[PDB]
């Protein structure tokens, strides 16, 4: 009975520690490492501050309120504590919504993934988020717009040891819609469009960039030949200066061995053009290529890139089955090759692409697309943690007391606890992971 309290207290204490530790770590990492100082991470910092205030100002007293089964901190702080609670939750979803809109314009810009905002504009947006959140949180609570007019509530308001958030229905609807549901619906809609755009970026360039890899500096391939970009051969000569000469002649300037990503893309589009012409000249590959759709043509070109026309022309049975749109059977034969034995991962993705005729095998391979998934996980987690709580707010406007007080409280704490998840989710990023282990003396 009472020993349970200590055990429950230690648990809630660890919850507080977890929230504060992790979010302090996030703030520190972004503030300290110049690498992490991006527009997105400024919003993340704003998001981390809301969670940090939750862990310091909100959760500790909510915990004590439950364990003591009454309020000990007085009416002033009860009203203040309540305001902070609503503020941090509001600012969090508003920030998440800003991230979604920011990421949409970033991914649709010709200046792709660059935020249209500068660092200074971002701070203004952030500051305006906290002003609006405070305007929608503190005002109604400090002006007493939220309060109900029935006696049970009136008693709780007046008595100093009662801190129950009794609200009138108009507030319950309006506040929950404006603070939560409006930025939630926008966030979900906009960031679903972000994923659509991200998926739409997948093409043969990204495919070969994932499968072969893009190298900005001159390197020797497996055969010892000088190569650059996505496996673009410069020369078979052992002279490095001969490669540099061919590179300059191809790119159109003094490169000294180094080219940009966009220039590698330029060379790649030429190599693709060359590959297709060669395919159409090959009597064994032409009928297959002619029959295939655009996506599977990219798959065939991918193979030609890796093995050359001759190596690909040797897949006589597979080519026949591909030509007849017998995908699974083509997949069975292709999986039984030296190709699949040497580069299974790459072969797995190309063969799967032959099977589906989509880019699904190349989802979330790019570092930038992985980063988008991380943000999507942040948003989804926040949604899942808070949605049940806010559904019950509306349900009780329809019919009050349908759901127990203890369940409603538990749904609140699922919301509270969410403030400790984001730091763990950021470990998906190689940059934060590197940042953290530096900060943690590793």
Ligand X SMILES: OC[C@H]1O[C@H](O[C@H]2[C@H](O)[C@@H](O)[C@H](O)O[C@@H]2CO)[C@H](O)[C@@H](O)[C@@H]1O
Ligand Y SMILES: *C(=O)CCCCCCCCCCCCCCC
Ligand Z SMILES: CC(C)NC[C@H](O)COc1cccc2[nH]c3ccccc3c12
Name the residues that contact ligand Y, by CB under 6 A: 439-441
Which of 215, 216, 343, 208 minimizes the C-alpha distance to 271?
Answer: 208
56 binding ligand CLR? (CB under 6 A)? yes
Listing from the earlier edge strand, what are the strands of the sheet with 226-229? 215-220, 226-229, 232-235
User: Looking at beta carbons only, is 72 or 142 nearer to ligand CLR?
Assistant: 142
Strand pairing partners for 217?
258
Q: Which is nearer to ligand Z, 82 or 353 (CB)?
A: 82
Q: Which residues of 322-357 are buried (b: 16+ CB within 10 A; e: fewer)?
A: beeeebeebbebbeebebbeeeeebbebbbbbbbee
Give the residue numbers marked as catalytic.
212, 221
Rounded distance, CA 419 to CA 432, Å? Answer: 18
Chosen residue from 14, 31, 274, 280 binding ligand CLR by CB under 6 A: 31
Binding region for ligand CLR (CB under 6 A) out of 121-129, 298-306, 318-326, 330-338 = 121-129
Please pick, from the candidates 39, 126, 292, 299, the single residue that binds ligand CLR as defined by CB under 6 A: 126
Q: What is the 8-class DSSP label of residue 326? A: -
Closer by beta carbon to ligand CLR, 362 or else 426: 426
Q: Does 54 bind ligand Z (CB under 6 A)?
A: no
* Residues in Cβ contact with 162 at an 8 Å cutoff, skipping those fewer than 6 apart: 70, 71, 155, 156
* Residue 41, token pair as written in the block: 């991470």
DSSP SS3 for 354: helix
Counting contacts by CB under 6 A, is residue 86 touching ligand Z? Answer: yes
Provide, rounded to whole angstroms, the least separation between the CB of residue 174 and ligand X.
59
Are 133 and 91 spatial neighbours (Cβ–Cβ below 8 Å)? Answer: yes
Q: Which tokens belong to 164?
A: 């129950």
Minimum distance, C-beta of residue 18 to ligand Z, in the bound complex (Å): 17
Handedness of CA 246, 250, 256, 258 (dihedral sign): negative
Question: Residue 83 or 227: which CB sits closer to ligand CLR?
Answer: 83
- Chain residues that interact with ligand CLR, rule: CB under 6 A: 16-17, 20-21, 24-25, 27-28, 31, 42, 45-46, 49, 52-53, 56-57, 84, 123, 126-127, 130, 439
Binding annotation? 85, 90, 175, 233, 305, 318, 333, 393, 412, 416
- Chain residues that interact with ligand Z, rule: CB under 6 A: 62, 82, 85-86, 89-90, 165, 167, 172, 175-176, 179-180, 393, 412, 415
Binding annotation for substrate? 233, 305, 318, 333
């Amino acid at each position: 009975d009472e020993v349970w309290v200590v055990g429950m207290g230690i648990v809630m204490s660890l919850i507080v520690l977890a929230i504060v530790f992790g979010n302090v770590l996030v703030i520190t990492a972004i503030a300290k490492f110049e690498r992490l100082q991006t527009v997105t991470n400024y919003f993340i910092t704003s998001l981390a501050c809301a969670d940090l205030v939750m862990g310091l100002a909100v959760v500790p007293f909510g915990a004590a309120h439950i364990l003591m089964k009454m309020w000990t901190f007085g009416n002033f702080w009860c009203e203040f504590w309540t305001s902070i609670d609503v503020l941090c939750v509001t600012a969090s979803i508003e920030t998440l919504c800003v991230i979604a809109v920011d990421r949409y314009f970033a991914i649709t810009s010709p200046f792709k993934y660059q935020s249209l905002l500068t660092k200074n504009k971002a701070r203004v947006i952030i500051l305006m988020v906290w002003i609006v959140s405070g305007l929608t949180s503190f005002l109604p609570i400090q002006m007493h717009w939220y309060r109900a007019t029935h006696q049970e509530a009136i008693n709780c308001y007046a008595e100093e040891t009662c801190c129950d958030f009794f609200t009138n229905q108009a507030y319950a609807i309006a506040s929950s819609i404006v603070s939560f549901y409006v930025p939630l619906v926008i966030m979900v809609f906009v960031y679903s469009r972000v994923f659509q755009e991200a998926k739409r970026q997948l093409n043969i360039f990204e495919m070969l960039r994932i499968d072969e890899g893009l190298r900005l500096k001159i390197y020797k391939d497996t055969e010892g030949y000088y190569t650059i970009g996505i496996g673009h051969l410069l020369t078979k000569s052992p002279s490095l200066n001969a490669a540099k000469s061919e590179l300059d002649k191809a790119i159109g300037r003094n490169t000294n061995g180094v080219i940009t990503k966009d220039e590698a893309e330029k060379l790649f589009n030429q190599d693709v053009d060359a590959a297709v012409r060669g395919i159409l000249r090959n009597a064994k590959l032409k009928p297959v290529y002619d029959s295939l759709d655009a996506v599977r043509r990219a798959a065939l070109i991918n193979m030609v890139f890796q093995m050359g026309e001759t190596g690909v022309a040797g897949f006589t049975n597979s080519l026949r089955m591909l030509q007849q749109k017998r995908w699974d059977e083509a997949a069975v034969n292709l999986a039984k090759s030296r190709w699949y034995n040497q580069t299974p991962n790459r072969a797995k993705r190309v063969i799967t692409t032959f099977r589906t005729g989509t880019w699904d095998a190349y989802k979330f391979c790019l570092k930038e697309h992985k980063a988008l998934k991380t943000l999507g996980i942040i948003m989804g987690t926040f949604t899942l943690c808070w949605l049940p709580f806010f559904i019950v707010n509306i349900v009780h406007v329809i019919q009050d007391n349908l759901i127990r007080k203890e369940v409603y409280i538990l749904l609140n704490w699922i919301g509270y606890v969410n403030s400790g998840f984001n730091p763990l989710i950021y470990c998906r990023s190689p940059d934060f992971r590197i940042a953290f282990q530096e900060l943690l003396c590793l």
